[PDB]
Amino acid sequence: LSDAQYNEANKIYFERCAGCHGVLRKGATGKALTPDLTRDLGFDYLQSFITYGSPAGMPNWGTSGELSAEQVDLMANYLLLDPAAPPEFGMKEMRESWKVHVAPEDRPTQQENDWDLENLFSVTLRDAGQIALIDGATYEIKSVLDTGYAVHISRLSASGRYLFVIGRDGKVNMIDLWMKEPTTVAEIKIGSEARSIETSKMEGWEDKYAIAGAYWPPQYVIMDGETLEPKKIQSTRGMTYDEQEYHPEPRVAAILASHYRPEFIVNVKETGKILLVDYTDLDNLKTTEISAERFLHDGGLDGSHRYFITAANARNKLVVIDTKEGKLVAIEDTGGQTPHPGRGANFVHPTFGPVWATSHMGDDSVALIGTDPEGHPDNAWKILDSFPALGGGSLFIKTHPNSQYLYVDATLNPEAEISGSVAVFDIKAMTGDGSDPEFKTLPIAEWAGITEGQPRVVQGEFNKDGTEVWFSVWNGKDQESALVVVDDKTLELKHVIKDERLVTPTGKFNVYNTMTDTY
Amino acid sequence: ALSDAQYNEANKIYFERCAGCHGVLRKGATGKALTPDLTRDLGFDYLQSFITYGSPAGMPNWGTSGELSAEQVDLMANYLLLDPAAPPEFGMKEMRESWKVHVAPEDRPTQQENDWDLENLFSVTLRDAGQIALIDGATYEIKSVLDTGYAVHISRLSASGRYLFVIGRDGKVNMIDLWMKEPTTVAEIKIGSEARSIETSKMEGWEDKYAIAGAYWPPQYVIMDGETLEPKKIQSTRGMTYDEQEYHPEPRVAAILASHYRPEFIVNVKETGKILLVDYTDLDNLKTTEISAERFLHDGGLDGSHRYFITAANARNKLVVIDTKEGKLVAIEDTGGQTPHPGRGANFVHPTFGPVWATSHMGDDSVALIGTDPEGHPDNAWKILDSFPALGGGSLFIKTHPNSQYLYVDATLNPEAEISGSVAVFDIKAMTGDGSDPEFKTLPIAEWAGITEGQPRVVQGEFNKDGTEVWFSVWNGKDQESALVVVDDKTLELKHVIKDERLVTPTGKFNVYNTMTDTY
Ligand code: DHE
Ligand code: DHE
Ligand code: HEC
Ligand code: HEC
Ligand SMILES: [C-]#N
Ligand SMILES: [C-]#N
């Protein structure tokens, strides 16, 4: 390629490919596109693949017209070359990507549709680059909205009016749920690779801000809660906590919002730092940089919403932060392999008191940590129990204050008999004597009534009353997927949601439970 | 063609012993640029001679001093003909490897074991000698000359006045116990490749707990134990510019001060234009305030009440004011001059305007005053109240003291030897804030010292403990004659001239008491 051709190629790569293939072409959701593999595949294989895509999730750039004839080829040739240096993504680049479709002045002053917004589910349509807004009681798809390729998660503002979605490429969409036809009212791009977004949830700061975290570049950005305007960009480049050596690319993992202080809770993976970022004053920016444990990923607030509990997954540890005092309080080994809680599950154990649970990706165990230092001090921040569920490959555990059951998936398990089902333990029957709590196996995939592809079940999500729990039956892009609704009280099939438009449904977020952090 | 081992060897030496003055990318600092476009023209032999014998302009004689062997000198001469290596990081492992406690704290004196008058001692920078001279403030005797290391820049004192900390341009930190029978370095460490600043914890209750050093490269600061220098917490300063919000890969740490309101360090981050308030109460659950200020931050000082930090964003001609009590920016004002360079500045009570802080300028002859009293003089607070001329451009330091009525302004870099050898003195008590330029008396400091040969540059006034006498450095070349001139504050007359064979290129002078209490 000439110098200018490589520049277009390089520009297109970082904006439209790095979200799935990575900034250093090492692959993420998409495959490694490094030269090693790339020379042997050769031009032709690469031109064809960029043109036609595949049902595994690679877009048909050529045939969709998304990249015209000649860009497939620039992107065929570029891929043979050596990996470019990943560029920065600052204020100037964010402001150019930032678009306000509907100014705040021109938005409704009251809900202008008859939807039950708090019982609404925002579902990620992975390979379709869209979200589906589904009614929680009548189970109908209210709307399907385009966000962008590699959509990952949905988060709600504290009043429940604004829906924020972010995809793997750092694309952020803001939707106004009060419009007659809810749509994207603002959008912006915050990096080349990202996974996290969150809203200000401190009483009094409702709808004030949104924050987004990037894998690359190493940074988070605080945006205006009503326009998505980028106010403050913070770099997360810094030193590891245990050896204090500089790390040039610390990714931002999960981001939560304090309910005790007007702060955002930011996980910085490779440095092992948890940041408490005060948004009361963005020019005189106060932060608490907490030394924790490397490999931070996901986590959630305890039942009282004071303590942040998060997985340092490759080290098999749970890190606990007190958001009121602003300091690390404990680091404990779960005794399992690679904890992956999502936001985890808080409940009252019959004998141990308030606990938070996590399942694991590397084994079948479920661990319980005591979360009440005031009333159960001898149990606080200790692993009180550990027992098996369906099997390894678990991603999400769920419960709700109105139910006595603990749901645990097994999404990544090799056996389909397992990955298509869910374990359910009766919380009220828990004793803590050594006896493995028994669990009931729900045949989620069987209830979908599907045979084709390779359906996997993932993540339970409750409705607003806590009477029904939803699970995604995740199947390939060209196959039939579904959402199974389980009746919490009877642990019986309630409803099966199937629709042409329900493509690769994964993360599901109930508006009320997400806005209030109820889990 | 140099081997890998040889090359690694040359690189370690370069970053450890040369970058301090030649720059981490070899583009120069006080030393010349050593990038291959210049060196290949000079050639091996020229480079080998220079490294071997050094020069009286400040380049050490590496070979002839035995610091580098003949093999190493040739190793460094070939390395300089090669393309610049990638500047390395300098984390905990590298800091700890350089960390050395010569006298554990349990083995040091429990009380002053010398007869000196510690509080009135002056720690003087002997720039091209790699040393500091400890001089008696009353007898004017050189009590001692201590090796710190090449590129020595400045001295700072722990809050109690017992420990003397010196930092050089290579990031070499020395800690000296002034209580020993015979004071010396009791601990040392290196905190980077290039550095300029250090400061001690000055919050009441934190006396002697911590010391902080800021580096130019890598971009970071380290908080160290105040008694042993153990590196406790390293923080990168890499980040975003405050105004354009673009990543900046090399934000240098300029001046570092200490708050008297909270247990915090006040760190200037130059290229990003950020002032950091760093809480040292708990280094693991580290609290900081990142203040968006103005780019090109450099030096500054606290006002007379020690509540507010006043600092120059020198290339943008601004003074940035930070309230250390509330931890917030309070003001940003243009001084009306070119390149404000206050050092720690000068605080005094102006006759009509109230409490003010002043600074002189490198780019012109103006002296500016900013009101520093929001409570008693609301309308004048954080506003430029007056601007008037002193000797001429090239000014670096302005000074005064609570026990004096005069404002002394040097002019070190002026091209005219008459001006650069002199100091301007203003009568604070005669000022009026009516627009008319105050008059000044010219003190012929170089002339008073009897120094005429070479280029005697007079720099930085520094008062003694009682604020009765002000010292000025008569800076001359290493091979020329230098001196310290002691001026009698009450009469503005020569009190004493300090001369000694060991007094080589004397620059910055720090009175123990005035430095430990931030009296200026
Ligand atoms: C940082 C991060 C968060 C926390 C977001 C927040 O705090 O707002 C998160 C949350 C999530 C959540 C939030 C659960 C909740 O209830 O909070 C879900 C459902 C989810 C479904 C998946 N994630 Fe996620 N996820 C990543 C990162 C993250 N995922 C990856 O780096 C990873 C492991 C690989 C990748 O390349 O993307 C990855 C793969 C997956 C999946 O394969 C999942 C199962 C399906 C999918 O859509 O791709 N991730
Ligand atoms: C960041 C910094 C500080 C604040 C220290 C602190 O807060 O603890 C400082 C302070 C200082 C102070 C502090 C005085 C005070 O009263 O606070 C002095 C006297 C001083 C004498 C000089 N400095 Fe300094 N100085 C630099 C940097 C700095 N000098 C430079 O980047 C520069 C411009 C060139 C260089 O490469 O080092 C430089 C040249 C000089 C000089 O040429 C001076 C005049 C004489 C010399 O020894 O080289 N610098
Ligand atoms: C996420 C939605 C993707 C984006 C955006 C892009 N690609 Fe992709 N790509 C993705 C996946 C999940 C896969 C695997 C396909 C499979 O069927 O297994 C791919 C694959 C490719 C390949 C083929 C490599 C191979 O080893 O077979 C190529 C050459 C490729 N992708 C290129 C490419 C380019 C140039 C993109 C930017 C326009 C791009 N992809 C975007 C997922 C995603
Ligand atoms: C500050 C204390 C220095 C240190 C440490 C080192 N050098 Fe230096 N160097 C310094 C100065 C002020 C000068 C200029 C001398 C002059 O007479 O003007 C130099 C010069 C050199 C040169 C000569 C370059 C030229 O253009 O003439 C060389 C080759 C050189 N220095 C090399 C060098 C090396 C290899 C060092 C590490 C051992 C080193 N210098 C340290 C100041 C300082
Ligand atoms: C997803 N982790
Ligand atoms: C130096 N200033």
- Chain A residues with CB under 8 Å of a chain B CB are 88, 90-92, 217, 219, 230, 232-235, 237-239, 243-246, 281, 283-291, 326-328
- Residues, chain A, total? 519
Minimal Cα–Cα distance from B268 to chain A, Å? 14
The answer to whether B445 touches B472, Cβ cutoff 8 Å, is yes
Residue A48 bridge partners (DSSP): none
The answer to whether A356 touches A368, Cβ cutoff 8 Å, is yes
* B368: nearest Cα among B319, B411, B295, B406: B319
Helices of type H across A367-443: 416-419
Last residue of a domain, one of B88, B115, B148: B88
B93, B238, B244 member nearest A235 (Cβ): B238
Cis peptide before A217 (omega within 30 of 0): yes
* A151: nearest Cα among A173, A134, A136: A173
B290 interaction partners in chain A (CB closer than 8 Å): 284-287
Grouping H, G, I as helix, E, B as strand and the rest as coil, residue B377 is coil
Q: Is the sign of the CA dihedral A475, A481, A483, A486 positive or negative?
A: negative
The answer to whether A161 touches A177, Cβ cutoff 8 Å, is yes
Residue A118 is classified by DSSP as G
Ligand 2 atom 27, closest CA: B196
**Structure tokens of B132?**
């500091």
Residues B111 and B17 in one domain: no
Grouping H, G, I as helix, E, B as strand and the rest as coil, residue B8 is helix
Phi, psi of B52 (to 5 degrees): -65, -55
- What is the enclosing helix (H) or strand (E) of B446? helix B445-449
The answer to whether A157 touches A199, Cβ cutoff 8 Å, is yes
Q: How many angstroms separate the CA atoms of A129 and A350, rounded? A: 43
- What is the enclosing helix (H) or strand (E) of A368? strand A365-370
> Scanning the structure block, which residue is given the tokens 């050898």?
B421
A233 interaction partners in chain B (CB closer than 8 Å): 240, 245
- What is the enclosing helix (H) or strand (E) of A105? none
Residue A348 bridge partners (DSSP): A354
Last residue of a domain, one of A64, A87, A110: A87
**Structure tokens of A93?**
């680049």
Which residues, at least 6 apart from A116, have a Cβ–Cβ distance to it below 8 Å?
A: A135, A136, A137
Q: How many angstroms separate the CA atoms of B499 and B141, rounded? A: 10
Q: Is the sign of the CA dihedral B424, B429, B430, B433 positive or negative?
A: positive
Residues B142 and B28 in one domain: no
Q: How many angstroms separate the CA atoms of A170 and B113, rounded? A: 64
Residue A82 is classified by DSSP as P
Ligand 1 atom 1, closest CA: A253
- Count of structural domains, chain B: 2
Last residue of a domain, one of A87, A115, A139: A87
Residue type, A42: G
Residues B35 and B82 in one domain: yes
Q: How many angstroms separate the CA atoms of B514 and B387, rounded? A: 27
Residue type, B116: W
* B311: nearest Cα among B326, B292, B294: B294
Which CA distances in Å does A4 have to A7, A33, A71, B12, B188? 5, 21, 13, 39, 53
Residues A97 and A189 in one domain: yes
**Structure tokens of A481?**
């997927």
Please give, one letter per residue, the 3-state secondary structure of B380-392.
Answer: CECCEEEEEECCC
* A10: nearest Cα among A60, A84, A73, A67: A84
* B177: nearest Cα among B137, B146, B203: B146
Parallel, antiparallel or unpaired: strands B328-334 and B318-323: antiparallel
- Does residue A152 have a known ligand-binding role? yes
Asked if A239 and B234 come within 8 Å (Cβ–Cβ), the reply is: yes
Residues B81 and B99 in one domain: no
Ligand 2 atom 45, closest CA: B507
- Ordered strands of the A405-408 beta sheet: A397-398, A405-408, A422-426, A439-442
- What is the enclosing helix (H) or strand (E) of A372? none
A219, A246, A281 member nearest B218 (Cβ): A246
**Structure tokens of B108?**
């040091």
Residues B108 and B201 in one domain: yes
How many alpha carbons lie under 13 Å from residue A197 in its C-beta half-sphere? 35
Number of H helices, E strands in chain B: 8, 35
Q: How many angstroms separate the CA atoms of B1 and B481, rounded? A: 44
What are the pocket residues of ligand 2 if the criterion is a CB atom closer than 6 Å to any ligand atom? B 29-30, 125, 127, 153-154, 156, 169, 196-199, 254-256, 299, 343-344, 396, 459-460, 507-508
Q: How many angstroms separate the CA atoms of B433 and A364, rounded? A: 80
B328 interaction partners in chain A (CB closer than 8 Å): 281, 284
A116 burial via Cβ count (<10 Å: 0-12, 13-18, 19+): middle
Helix, strand, coil percentages, rounded to 5, for chain B: 15, 40, 45
Number of H helices, E strands in chain A: 9, 35
Which CA distances in Å does A136 have to A112, A461, A498? 19, 11, 14
Grouping H, G, I as helix, E, B as strand and the rest as coil, residue A390 is coil
- E-state strands within B314-412: 318-323, 328-334, 346-350, 354-359, 366-371, 384-389, 398-399, 406-409
What's A39's domain CATH number?
Answer: 1.10.760.10
Q: How many angstroms separate the CA atoms of B359 and B338, rounded? A: 11
The DSSP result for A464-505, as a single string, is SSSSEEEEEEE--TTS--EEEEEETTTTEEEEEE--TT--SE
- Ordered strands of the B366-371 beta sheet: B346-350, B354-359, B366-371, B384-389
Which residues, at least 6 apart from B277, have a Cβ–Cβ distance to it below 8 Å?
A: B259, B262, B264, B265, B266, B288, B289, B291, B322, B324, B327
The method of structure determination was: X-ray
Residues A22 and A119 in one domain: no
List active site positions of A.
17, 20-21, 58, 297, 340
Residues B65 and B193 in one domain: no
- Chain B residues with CB under 8 Å of a chain A CB are 89, 91-93, 218, 220, 231, 233-236, 238-240, 244-247, 282, 284-292, 327-329
Residues A125 and A161 in one domain: yes
What's B452's domain CATH number?
Answer: 2.140.10.20
Minimal Cα–Cα distance from B483 to chain A, Å? 44
- Which atom of ligand 1 lies nearest, measured to the CA of A152? 47
Residues B95 and B68 in one domain: no
Q: How many angstroms separate the CA atoms of A482 and A476, rounded? A: 11
Asked if B91 and A285 come within 8 Å (Cβ–Cβ), the reply is: no
- Residues, chain B, total? 520
Residues A247 and A350 in one domain: yes
The answer to whether B468 touches B489, Cβ cutoff 8 Å, is yes
Q: How many angstroms separate the CA atoms of A237 and B417, rounded? A: 48
Q: Is the sign of the CA dihedral A181, A182, A185, A191 positive or negative?
A: negative
Residues A131 and A143 in one domain: yes
* B309: nearest Cα among B274, B271, B259, B272: B259
Report the interhelical angle of A69-80 vs A3-16 (nearest 10°): 90
Cis peptide before B105 (omega within 30 of 0): no
The answer to whether B121 touches B137, Cβ cutoff 8 Å, is yes
Cα A324 from chain centre: 25
Q: Name the residue range of residue B23's domain.
A: 1-88
